[PDB]
Design a protein around this ligand. Structure first.
Ligand SMILES: Nc1ncnc2c1ncn2[C@@H]1O[C@H](COP(=O)(O)OP(=O)(O)OP(O)(O)=S)[C@@H](O)[C@H]1O
Ligand SMILES: Nc1ncnc2c1ncn2[C@@H]1O[C@H](COP(=O)(O)OP(=O)(O)OP(O)(O)=S)[C@@H](O)[C@H]1O
Ligand SMILES: Nc1ncnc2c1ncn2[C@@H]1O[C@H](COP(=O)(O)OP(=O)(O)OP(O)(O)=S)[C@@H](O)[C@H]1O
Lengths: 350, 146, 53, 146
């Protein structure tokens, strides 16, 4: 008159422990501790102790069936680990409700945070605590660049059926190439925050990574996420295997992939084919529009000092970067006149 | 059990990937790419399709002459020209599966490769993407192919 | 008076598991949960839970 | 100024993280100043050796994220560099980079560093700790012989 259900190390597993931690009508002994890096706005006083159900047996009520959970490890501990449920009324219909509720709780994105996944073996894993969403107006790119990328992305996400009707694989790839300190990674964070998508950062220079593992990682991304390939020019992966992973019979479906470089010419023409990298945009050094909007972002309000600042930058005739401008504005916090005085310091680079 | 697992879904192609010395399904089945969606040059699609159908039809003719019943096709050209797309379309047309094999995989040996090529699932197409890229030996690959 | 067939990591083993999952006459008090993607052209791809024995 | 203005960074979306570089001839007081400043702030020192062979990119990201609170990250001889260059660059400033950390780097060969590592979002403050000046000579004599 009992019906037991288990699940091994899969995506449904961690969702289920996260759900069981939050379950109110729970009677758990055999609990475990878990320190985590919580954060306050003034400063992150981390190491908040959290008590989790941990290994052993637990009683939860849920909808009125009194389910017994059993978390236990084996010879090893992430190997050899499993939870087990038992219902005493042949009410196995509650198991799918439990799984769906756990999936919804886990998939619920925190309203002002962006989740970062990192490749750990052949599957993705949460990295650290979720980071606060970077806002799109903070990232000062050139005129039309931000709008062009956003229009292309929204056009791709909206037109799902249009791809399938014509047989084109529903997958888009974007390249941001340019000098260092131009806003590429910052724009990735901002756009992922805008779409409320996660980021799956993947490092191909990882020696343990192989072609089969690469294809599994590319095909097992969590839903509502963006694949990030920082420094695609850096490259145990093979060139043909990477090319087939990006666009091939083995390539996945409904993915946004982003790659950034400082050396676009180092890329082969095969990787730059317009079916692997569909959109490529040059995120260059600071332009006077960028200088003016960066100054207005850091020093809102007054514009005459902004006008003098951008004129002095133009007279300085130096290929400044927006990272350099951000550093200068950080040095002179709430002092636009001091920044206008120290504008000559952007010339030095050693 | 064999009939259930061997039946193909009406509009999708299964993809098999070399995992050790045997094949296994990779991911969920992908929807069939249609042959009219692949724009190749005039007579190219028709010529390849006629040659493939002629080969599959004439099973006995190969055996009577003693020729090994096995055909090999090479699609060479510039990047982004339709090669992989045509492979997907033709495998969808024949209701065959694609068995993708990566020779640059370091754990692959000659004995493993012979076992893989001799144990493909029924009604499937072996796909060697970027044959020019190449623990496999040249002589072992040559003897495995013919 | 009984018979017993065993098959172990064979190409028919996965076939037998798939056939057993599809069997409606199955009465299994033990279940396993494995996530699977239900890919549908309408909307977006979604995950789904499979109660294999 | 950096430790005080925690909220000002968050308001403009800049990652709350600063990087310092001391460069110069050997024996100019770089390491000694690191110890003195860590003692002044009552912070610990987390010394990390990038040249250590068993260190990998995932391990380094975990180390730079799981630092103990109120501590200084010290990267002695940054120019010395299983870690990858791109992995180090993304660790110091990237999506995977941590928050509210002071990192200090020393080198006797600043020109051996790339432009990317010397970026003013990775290395914010760079000061030349050089050979002894007559002011330094006088102050050292006063310290040793009051
Ligand atoms: N256009 C920009 N608008 C706002 N902040 C910027 C901009 N460009 C750079 N920054 C800041 O400067 C730092 C570096 O910018 P990132 O975008 O993270 O790096 P990057 O431009 O991709 O250069 P790399 O080294 O190739 S990753 C971060 O602290 C950003 O906040
Ligand atoms: N002849 C074609 N007709 C229709 N779509 C095509 C054609 N050639 C390429 N495409 C599209 O272009 C993209 C890549 O085509 P592929 O055939 O995969 O590339 P390729 O020709 O195999 O070259 P590679 O780089 O060696 S794989 C896909 O989105 C295809 O739909
Ligand atoms: N400016 C200084 N003021 C006081 N003591 C100093 C100074 N420079 C050097 N010393 C002494 O000499 C030692 C060497 O200084 P360190 O800072 O430890 O080494 P360094 O200057 O970093 O040179 P290296 O070889 O690049 S680590 C210190 O431990 C002090 O004992």
């Amino acid at each position: 008159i009992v019906d037991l259900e288990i699940q091994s190390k899969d995506k449904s597993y961690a969702w289920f422990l996260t759900w069981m931690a939050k379950h109110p009508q729970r009677v758990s002994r055999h609990l475990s501790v878990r320190t985590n890096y919580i954060q306050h706005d003034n400063g992150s006083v981390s190491t908040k102790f959290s008590l989790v159900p941990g290994p052993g047996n637990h009683w939860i009520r849920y909808k009125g069936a009194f389910i017994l959970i059993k978390r236990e490890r084996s010879a090893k501990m992430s190997p050899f680990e499993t939870v087990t449920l038992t219902t005493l009324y042949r009410d196995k219909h509650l198991f799918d409700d439990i799984l769906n509720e756990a999936k919804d709780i886990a998939l619920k994105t925190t309203e002002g945070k962006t989740v970062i996944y990192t490749s750990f073996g052949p599957e993705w894993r949460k990295f650290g605590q979720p980071k606060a969403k970077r806002m799109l107006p903070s990232v000062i790119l050139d005129s039309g660049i931000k709008e062009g990328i956003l229009d292309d992305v929204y056009d791709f996400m909206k037109n799902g059926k249009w791809y399938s009707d014509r047989g084109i694989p529903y997958r888009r790839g974007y390249l941001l190439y340019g000098p260092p300190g131009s806003g590429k990674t910052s724009f990735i964070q901002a756009l992922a925050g805008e779409l409320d998508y996660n980021i799956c950062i993947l490092n191909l220079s990882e020696n343990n990574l192989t072609d089969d593992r690469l294809n599994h990682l590319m095909n097992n991304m969590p839903e509502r996420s963006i694949l990030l390939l920082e420094d695609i020019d850096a490259a145990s992966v093979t060139f043909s295997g990477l090319l087939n992973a990006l666009d091939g019979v083995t390539s996945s479906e409904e993915t946004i992939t982003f790659m950034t470089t400082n050396h676009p010419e180092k890329l082969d023409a095969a990787i730059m084919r317009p079916g692997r990298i569909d959109y490529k945009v040059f995120v260059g050094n600071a332009t006077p529009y960028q200088v003016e909007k960066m100054f207005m972002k850091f020093y809102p309000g007054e514009t005459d000092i902004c006008k003098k600042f951008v004129n002095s930058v133009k007279e300085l005739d130096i290929t400044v970067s927006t990272a350099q401008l951000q550093g200068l504005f950080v040095m002179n916090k709430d002092a636009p006149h001091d920044a206008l005085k120290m504008v000559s310091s952007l010339r030095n680079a050693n």
